[PDB]
């Protein structure tokens, strides 16, 4: 569509919080039961710094790096956050992905999009119908050489995990009712997989898409996690080994409990600071100066 230009553009300052113990999702689709299983993959380390903002002069959302994957949480009453855009240049030069969940369905398209400066999704209240109806969508100026397309058929916390690995963009999703008013809630809830897309593109930055009438972001890291599958197979709890020595012990014993005692955990090895090379400095100095610095040269 045609981009809508805003003379005044602004972005609210970022805020910081603690991840507590969220970001856990099922690594695979292998059922299990009443077992403690260890898995090393990209996870949200517990109690990690979380960068969060508010989604409302045109207050435009910021472009955030993607790194190895992003854990994106949205606390809202109505579905304000609707989608995201992923890529490196976020222009027609390189393939860019766009995910959205409009009033109709979910649209996911990988194309050489030309994203607008201020992507706009606008809805108006239909007084006669007494229902809001979306009527404005100005996100990308152009979309050429599309590489993928797929269209689907008391606050709320919607958590999502986006992981670009092996050309596969894996999205895991979870939805919960949260009664907290502000701040990232402290609690445990596994994120079920939503869908994997073999897009096979490079992603380094992404931006959030809001509707016009809070959210938190964290970066996953390579970590080892001890997941406790209960009788029904739902992950009841998780332990981050490298969070702290105690968790390292817990992962050592494959238990959500360590009894009093001393356990050989790891092996500490220091490494040389530098290299030293010494020889018989000069056995004899080669007399090169006598040739070059000779006052007189021969014919």
């Amino acid at each position: 569509s045609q981009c809508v230009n805003f003379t005044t553009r602004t972005q609210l300052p970022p805020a910081y919080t603690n991840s507590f113990t969220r970001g856990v999702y099922y690594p695979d689709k292998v059922f299990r039961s009443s077992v403690l299983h260890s898995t090393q993959d990209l996870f949200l380390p517990f109690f990690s710094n979380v960068t969060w903002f508010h989604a409302i002069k045109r207050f435009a959302n910021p472009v955030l790096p993607f790194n190895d994957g992003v854990y994106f949480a949205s606390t809202e009453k109505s579905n304000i956050i609707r989608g995201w855009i992923f890529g490196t240049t976020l222009d027609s030069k390189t393939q860019s992905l766009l995910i959205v969940n409009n009033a109709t369905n979910v649209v996911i398209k990988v194309c050489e999009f030309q994203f607008c400066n201020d992507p706009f999704l606008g809805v108006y209240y239909h007084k006669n119908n007494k229902s809001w109806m979306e009527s404005e969508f100005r996100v990308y100026s152009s979309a050429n050489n599309c590489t993928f397309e797929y269209v689907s058929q008391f606050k709320n916390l919607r958590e999502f995990v986006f992981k670009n690995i092996d050309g596969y963009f894996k999205i895991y999703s979870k939805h919960t009712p949260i009664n907290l008013v502000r701040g990232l809630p402290q609690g445990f809830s596994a994120l079920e997989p939503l869908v994997d897309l073999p897009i096979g593109i490079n992603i380094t930055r992404f931006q959030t898409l809001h509707i016009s009438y809070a959210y938190y972001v964290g970066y996953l890291q390579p970590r080892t996690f001890l997941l406790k599958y209960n009788e029904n197979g739902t992950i009841t709890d998780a332990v981050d080994c490298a969070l702290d020595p105690l968790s390292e012990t817990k992962c050592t014993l494959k238990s959500f409990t360590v009894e009093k005692g001393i356990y050989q955990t790891s092996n500490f090895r220091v490494q040389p600071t530098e290299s030293i090379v010494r020889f018989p400095n000069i056995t004899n100095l080669c007399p090169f100066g006598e040739v070059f610095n000779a006052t007189r040269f021969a014919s």
């Binding site: 689709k29 059922f31 039961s33 197979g233």
Partner: peptide, 20 residues
């Protein structure tokens, strides 16, 4: 009677062997 989740096809025991 196991309550397989929609995305779950098969389960494995402590031996990682196909139990269901």
């Amino acid at each position: 009677n196991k309550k397989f989740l929609p995305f779950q096809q098969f389960g494995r025991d402590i031996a990682d062997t196909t139990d269901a």
